């Protein structure tokens, strides 16, 4: 009896669990904290680097560094620490007895998959592994075979149209614009009130302000006048030291960067146009099914008002006789992991693993042939 | 107990049924669909090829090809799949229990009916069979015994004169112009409006616009001046995406290509001059009855206004003493199959089936002797 491990490892949050469950076993931010003071109370649990939750509970005295920026692992020593903490401390299972199903964003460099496989086979010594596109698992979990997945994680936002199970890789779109950019833009617009957050341990406080207070306005040019006329839109927040801030207008100007990336100084089109263009890249026949099966996923789409605004946009963009339905369940914060656990448990999948024998025969260059 | 199987097997669209009925049991386009992308959800309906109706609805991710091109079977490995789908899926009857009546276009290459018979016996193991001319069956179904049949399907057009039930092989006229040549000319002329259909999936949309909006005009120059004078002929059609295209003048420019093949870069004359020369090739004594029983059949002749136009042209070509009657049955889309069924139900025809033991005597070449 061996059961695969489904380990997401996306930017911002790592979610690991066993294959065949309805929820991830262990979710924790994918950070690594280096202590930036020299403490002399030796023997009290001192370390050289704190991983995951242990970093947050100490973020006051640490420099938090994300090993994955925009879907790309910029530091592999830190990623090995993340994976070791996932294997031996959160799941508490030896990796050499279970296959591992990792996920990746589309249009990433091939070195990312190459090193993922090399690490999973030479360091953790797993018997088998796989690498899946996240927006495909986000459709597996939704119980579908036709639809356009709009996956917006913490660091990257990509759209994948699939029809009857046949993906259209000539219409997969990617946009390096996600929670981490919205959190760095809120850190900027908060200075207009007088609030100055600069430390990497205050980027977390700003990310909390954003994920607790901010919402997406259905009409930006009207909600601006609303928040300008009356104070019936302000909300107060209590920092972890006592001070209180209040934010009335920033609430919907933070996630509005998703629909007007020019706010961040980016030429690219918003997420609604990113989805619409990715629909209109397909064939004339399958566009109607892609319209009415628009799936959402990832944490960045957990904004109150995201589905209403997305529908209002893609309806003013689509032909007047097409019905748009934004499939947005409240369990979309972890749809990719559910899709992974569904895929890893299937019987017809048990031949799609990359076996250790296969890796020993062709090195890390194999992950390009097997993994779609 | 047993009943013969009548399969039209015409180019472009396939019809099939049981001998002795007034309607074909199953009609399905002769399209072989193959996936041109690579599926990413394995186990959710992966099939190497889709045939018939399943190759029409799923055309968004398929490349579709026609086994028969200009009446000649170009891909026998696909004709085998079409025949298998006709036997085992649409009718759900085994071939080893019923005779099979195939139909062929006149002046078709020698190996065509030979390989037809060979495949019928060596693969499906049919008890008896026949290869009848596609045109002569239409006069049978029309309820007459003298006249010239004008059979313009999807791949071949042909005018065949028959008197007293005996065909006149010396006056058979064939024209490679057909309904698929009109589809291709529409795919060209539609660009002048600003529309682009070039994909095999979109050729089906072009065929649907053709058989829904296009119509033969009675005086092409007068209708051209009507369109250039005031826009009152334009019609709106909605693609499966929801765009609202608008074809005006282009309504009759497509069917007119039947009467003037110079629009398609062809040298031969129109269908009216074709019928005129075919009739004037017939014996002088019988011509008096020919001009009275000129019958249209097949799909492509179902154009709005083709009857009046054919009558005007042929009576302006033929002398005024002659009586021109363009008899157009209101169900001429299946007349070939109706006539095939009528012929197959005859006790006299129960001796005209090329039997298996007869096939074993002289090889497939036997088909050249029995069939007229």
């Amino acid at each position: 009896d061996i059961a695969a491990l489904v380990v997401d490892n996306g930017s911002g949050m790592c979610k690991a669990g066993f294959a065949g469950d309805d929820a991830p076993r262990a979710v924790f931010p994918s950070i690594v904290g280096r202590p930036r003071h020299q403490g002399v109370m030796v023997g009290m649990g001192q370390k050289d680097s704190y991983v995951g939750d242990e970093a947050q509970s100490k973020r006051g005295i640490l420099t938090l560094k994300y090993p994955i920026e925009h879907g790309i692992v910029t530091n592999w020593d830190d990623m090995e620490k993340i994976w070791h903490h996932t294997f031996y401390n959160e799941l508490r299972v030896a990796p050499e007895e279970h296959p591992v199903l990792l996920t990746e964003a589309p249009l990433n460099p091939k070195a990312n998959r190459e090193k993922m496989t090399q690490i999973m086979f030479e360091t953790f010594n797993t018997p088998a592994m796989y690498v899946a596109i996240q927006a495909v698992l986000s459709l597996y979990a939704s119980g579908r075979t036709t639809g356009i997945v709009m996956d917006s994680g913490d660091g990257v936002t990509h759209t994948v149209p699939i029809y009857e199970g046949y993906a259209l890789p000539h219409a997969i779109l990617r946009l390096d614009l996600a929670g981490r950019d919205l959190t760095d833009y809120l850190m900027k617009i908060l200075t207009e009130r007088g609030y100055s957050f600069t430390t990497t341990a205050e980027r977390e406080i700003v990310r909390d302000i954003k994920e607790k207070l901010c919402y997406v306005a259905l009409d930006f040019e009207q909600e601006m006048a609303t928040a300008a006329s009356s104070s019936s839109l302000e909300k107060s927040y209590e920092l972890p030291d006592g001070q209180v801030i209040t934010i009335g207008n920033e609430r919907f100007r933070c996630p509005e960067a998703l629909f007007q990336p020019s706010f961040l100084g980016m030429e690219s089109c918003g997420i609604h146009e990113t989805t619409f263009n990715s629909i209109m890249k397909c064939d004339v026949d399958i566009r109607k099914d892609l319209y009415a099966n628009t799936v959402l996923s990832g944490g960045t789409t957990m904004y109150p008002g995201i589905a209403d605004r997305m529908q209002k946009e893609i309806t003013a963009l689509a032909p007047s006789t097409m019905k748009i339905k934004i499939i947005a369940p409240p369990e979309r914060k972890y749809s990719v992991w559910i899709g992974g656990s569904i895929l890893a448990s299937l019987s017809t999948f048990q031949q799609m693993w990359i076996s250790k024998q296969e890796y020993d025969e062709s090195g890390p260059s194999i992950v390009h042939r097997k993994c779609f | 107990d047993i009943a013969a199987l009548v399969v039209d097997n015409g180019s472009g669209m396939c019809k099939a049924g049981f001998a002795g009925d007034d309607a074909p049991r199953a009609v399905f386009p002769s399209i072989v669909g193959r996936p041109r992308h690579q599926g990413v959800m394995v186990g959710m309906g992966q099939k190497d090829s889709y045939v018939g109706d399943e190759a029409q609805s799923k055309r968004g991710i398929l490349t579709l090809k026609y086994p028969i091109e200009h009446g000649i079977v170009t891909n026998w490995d696909d004709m085998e799949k079409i025949w298998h789908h006709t036997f085992y899926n649409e009718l759900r009857v085994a071939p080893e229990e019923h005779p099979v009546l195939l139909t062929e276009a006149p002046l078709n290459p020698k190996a065509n009916r030979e390989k037809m018979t060979q495949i019928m016996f060596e693969t499906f193991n049919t008890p008896a069979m026949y290869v009848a001319i596609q045109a002569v069956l239409s006069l049978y179904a029309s309820g007459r015994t003298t006249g010239i049949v004008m059979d313009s399907g999807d791949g071949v057009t042909h005018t065949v004169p028959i008197y007293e039930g005996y065909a006149l092989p010396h006056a058979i006229l064939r024209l490679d112009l057909a309904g698929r040549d009109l589809t291709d000319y529409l795919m060209k002329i539609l660009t002048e409006r600003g529309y682009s259909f070039t994909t095999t999936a979109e050729r089906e949309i072009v065929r649907d616009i053709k058989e829904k909006l296009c119509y033969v005009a009675l005086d092409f120059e007068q209708e051209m001046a009507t369109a250039a004078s005031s826009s009152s002929l334009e019609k709106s059609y909605e693609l499966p995406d929801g765009q609202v295209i608008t074809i005006g003048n282009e309504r009759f420019r497509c069917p007119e290509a039947l009467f003037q093949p110079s629009f398609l870069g062809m040298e031969s004359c129109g269908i009216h001059e074709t019928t005129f020369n075919s009739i004037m090739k017939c014996d002088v004594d019988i011509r008096k009855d020919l001009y009275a029983n000129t019958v249209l059949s097949g799909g492509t002749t179902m154009y709005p206004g083709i009857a009046d136009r054919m009558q005007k042209e042929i009576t302006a070509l033929a002398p005024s003493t002659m009586k021109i009657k363009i008899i157009a049955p209101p169900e001429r889309k299946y007349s070939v199959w109706i006539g095939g069924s009528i012929l197959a139900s005859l006790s006299t025809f129960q001796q005209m089936w090329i039997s298996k033991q007869e096939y074993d005597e002289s090889g497939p070449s036997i088909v050249h002797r029995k069939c007229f």
């Binding site: 009857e164 026949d285 934004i326 | 109706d53």
Partner: peptide
């Protein structure tokens, strides 16, 4: 929860494949 919207439809829902007049006969 409370992040579901008025125009949001649960993944539990499923539409049917596209069937346009160009696909019948």
């Amino acid at each position: 929860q409370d992040r579901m919207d008025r125009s949001a439809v649960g993944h539990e829902y499923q539409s049917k494949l596209s069937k346009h007049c160009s696909q019948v006969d």
